[model samples]
Target: NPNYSFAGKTSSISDLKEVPRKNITLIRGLGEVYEGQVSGPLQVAVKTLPEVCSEQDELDFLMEALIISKFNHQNIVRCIGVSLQSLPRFILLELMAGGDLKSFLRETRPRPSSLAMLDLLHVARDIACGCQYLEENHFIHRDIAARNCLLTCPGPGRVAKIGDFGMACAMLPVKWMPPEAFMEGIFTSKTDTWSFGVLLWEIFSLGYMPYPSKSNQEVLEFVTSGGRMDPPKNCPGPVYRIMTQCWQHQPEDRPNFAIILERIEYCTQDPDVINTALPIEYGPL
Candidate 1:
């Protein structure tokens, strides 16, 4: 616990708040996010982890908290505070009003446009920057997905921040996972690149499921056997090219997020992307 700060950051449910129900939904095991304030009304998501007698789960949670607390990056979700003094332990996090990237893409029907071309590029760039920082620090973000990426605020100014570390060490989704990870359960920054490739697919395609028609095993077979996702209909050619680079079969051959940041930034500049108006939305669609 010495690794993370606990002084002057305790919560007593005095700052409790609620999610705007009609605007979003949360995954299982997480409580409704709230605004924890003292200096200001900064939106903060507080998680009161479920009761567990299992020592392993508790340990995993503690370790993740330490890892997350050590993080300090604009693209990385910040830990506001944590209290392990009792049952239903609490973990507070900086809130991204725009919500997770996954919901922004496919939650609605026929997704498209919620974010402008430049805004889209910026979100992609932000995440790349975060991952690059992590990779340079020798810390691998085992989970790299749009679902893990959060929007800092609602569109047209929304930005991406990576979060949800609970499953980071537990392999990952078969659809987005690298072959080595799926089979050998090994993870590294390179495997993260593979998932980033999958993430690019999500962004360009507006949230379509990876290997949409395929089952988990089927998708695994497809990717491991040299298959790759086709470029989305709206995918910019240059961007897809960068994505393909991240998907290299040999993990070492995959481009790191540092390289990734440069490539995507190049893609944006190459097109001289115009700052078009974004469709109205509370956050990302």
Candidate 2:
């Protein structure tokens, strides 16, 4: 269709060359993602649709691609271009060499060092900044979790950017979702703030799943009953305070992304207050 557009920047299929992968970067229900580089040699993560896709898949792909293309923020993943000339469609995104935050946090295991605390704070602020932009644009990121966040590189100076829009304009997760969302399928920017609260827990907890040992139904009941997650071990007092505000039972009681960003930035200024010593005694998961 002539309507295929990426904010008026679409890429030619030839200019896109796949960099053979030893192992798929990620396996999506829609398709597999492979490493690739545009003609200029700028690395990219190419998400390809299956050769034979259902009408629903095509529609969803178009929806996600269009939404991502319009976004312009350093904290949000950049969409280079897209190609739908063939059955197996392609959407090119600026490669995040550091991979997803969920894995990154689990791998690194934050310790009681000023730098570790500062890094976590920076990433939190980065996501809040991006979510603030989405809020201003009137977009509700239905899925806001550590896994959906991507890092530019590994460790010090690594920048976190939001990624994976498959569930955006559309939990996200029962545990991450707010009561309104899990109970009534209602989603708003406030609902995103609720999930952001859980995301903060995930980061501070070093990627442990929220509401551990709880099932989806249990989480639904737990949230509906006005239950909230406790502060993660070693989480800074100020940061945890912000997280609690995001999980207010009443969505209106929750702070908006802009406010959240401001709070995070404030915490960033006091690095000593945010530092937490890692408990190496607890072995890896």
Candidate 3:
């Protein structure tokens, strides 16, 4: 009989089909470190949370997982089941075979093929759709970094599935997120927008890490000093302009997800109309 401890619980294997691969083949990818299994069908990724973390943390994690599981969208990862059988909890989720956007960029060279731009546009569209849904549902994805965005399909144009709901919640306040969030902490929807902006920069730059030359402190200072990511060569002017708008000091000053989506859509439709030059001015925070 499997041991069922109070602090940790094993997941039930009812809906999950057994596979032949070694359980150890699966590894932790991003965010919190947890053991995961890649199902044989290559369609699902199952994560198991160890009991080492606090019960409260586990509950919070579970709640976040549940929220993500309930959210059904092509742009978002689908949650299949939660196992509460043994000590540590387990969560079954759709596998993003394409991998995270950040990693994809790192593995691939920097160069904007029309195909690459289209792929990014597809991802942006999906993320915007997910963001609009969250806003409509009165929820906020506090963490919107590229690491949190997963790729569901393969190829030159892959679909992005937004993941990592640990810090997600229902709330919106300009000042709700601490400065640390921009530096490091819980972020808000606006912060999510900020992340999206950074993501845009990353995509255009071919997966370059933001603020390459600066130290953490210097990066924070630069951000506080109105520093924004430099536009890459051949980057569309309007896209660069939108990225600048997202990094604005005041949260309210940043464009909403809907507006951002509209602008991106417009640019996609008429790429020639967009200015491909960098903005000369930085707005107040």
Q: What is the TM-score of each predicted model, taking all chains together? A: 0.79, 0.84, 0.73
Q: What does candidate 1's lDDT look like per residue over 24-68, in tens digits?
A: 223333323444442314445766567855776676556555667
lDDT of 2 by residue, 4-76 (tens): 4542355333444333333223333322777775551456687888878799788767656676767789999
lDDT score for candidate 2 against the true structure = 0.78
* Native-to-model Cα distance after best TM-score fit, residue 21 in candidate 3, in Å: 16
lDDT of 3: 0.63
Clashing pairs in 2: 112-276, 112-277, 112-278
Q: How accurate is candidate 1 locally (lDDT)?
A: 0.70
What is each predicted model's overall lDDT from 0 to 1? Answer: 0.70, 0.78, 0.63
Q: Which 10-residue span in candidate 1 carries the lowest summed lDDT?
A: 17-26
Candidate 3 worst ten-residue window by lDDT = 1-10
Off by over 4 Å in 1: 1-42, 107-113, 165-172, 272-285
lDDT string for model 3 (175-213, tens) is 222244644554567776787787788777766667778
| Top candidate, metric lDDT | 2
